[PDB]
Design a protein around this ligand. Sequence first.
Ligand SMILES: CCC(=O)c1cc(-c2cc(OC)c(Cn3ccnc3)c(OC)c2)c2ccccn12
Ligand SMILES: CCC(=O)c1cc(-c2cc(OC)c(Cn3ccnc3)c(OC)c2)c2ccccn12
Lengths: 104, 105
Amino acid sequence: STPIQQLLEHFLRQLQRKDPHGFFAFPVTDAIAPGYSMIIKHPMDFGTMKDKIVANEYKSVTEFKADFKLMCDNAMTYNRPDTVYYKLAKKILHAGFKMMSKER
Amino acid sequence: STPIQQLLEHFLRQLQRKDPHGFFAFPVTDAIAPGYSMIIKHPMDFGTMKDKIVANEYKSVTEFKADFKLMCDNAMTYNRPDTVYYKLAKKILHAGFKMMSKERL
Ligand SMILES: CCC(=O)c1cc(-c2cc(OC)c(Cn3ccnc3)c(OC)c2)c2ccccn12
Ligand SMILES: CCC(=O)c1cc(-c2cc(OC)c(Cn3ccnc3)c(OC)c2)c2ccccn12
């Protein structure tokens, strides 16, 4: 129940609110996205990021952002620009970096 | 705030709870589903069904079911069986038939 665990849970909820349909909520499977596990080797989702917040695995804000950036980068690498998953990733990426940089 | 509006809102919430990702929450567009407007001429969603519940446009349970059936049928007509949207429609269909069968008491 640390001061960082407070801060990252606050950050996560605010980002999860930008994903109302829950595309970033758990891992993408090959059933719904063919070839995903071959193309993306470092998968990331909000679900996984929450499990790391409970298990206290984030030592800094930057470690949280790193995963956040990875999730969005995976989306913008696997999906074409015309897709909803891509566009959502790009918005959410930009919004997330403004939401948790140079603040107090 | 009628006795039918109570009943249909209860029905709607129970079905909407089976669609956590909200694929049935507003109209499908051709941007996300190519050729949808050519294949499906009578689109229906939970959003539209909620607007009709507020504006009291459902005179009976059967009028509600009719739309419910249309939404699910559109899904099972446009999408292939192996897709997420199909399987979700088929579950939601079956759940509605049990929820609103001839035994409503
Ligand atoms: C953002 C991750 C992404 O690229 C993504 C997410 C989804 C995605 C994720 C989902 O749950 C996390 C779901 C919801 N889902 C998954 C299994 N059953 C429902 C989904 O439904 C169409 C699409 C998806 C689908 C095809 C191609 C890419 N994606
Ligand atoms: C169930 C209706 C259906 O068949 C359906 C719904 C969706 C669908 C609907 C959505 O919003 C109501 C959404 C959510 N969305 C779309 C644009 N911004 C969010 C979605 O996620 C990709 C898929 C879809 C997509 C491709 C092919 C069929 N469908």
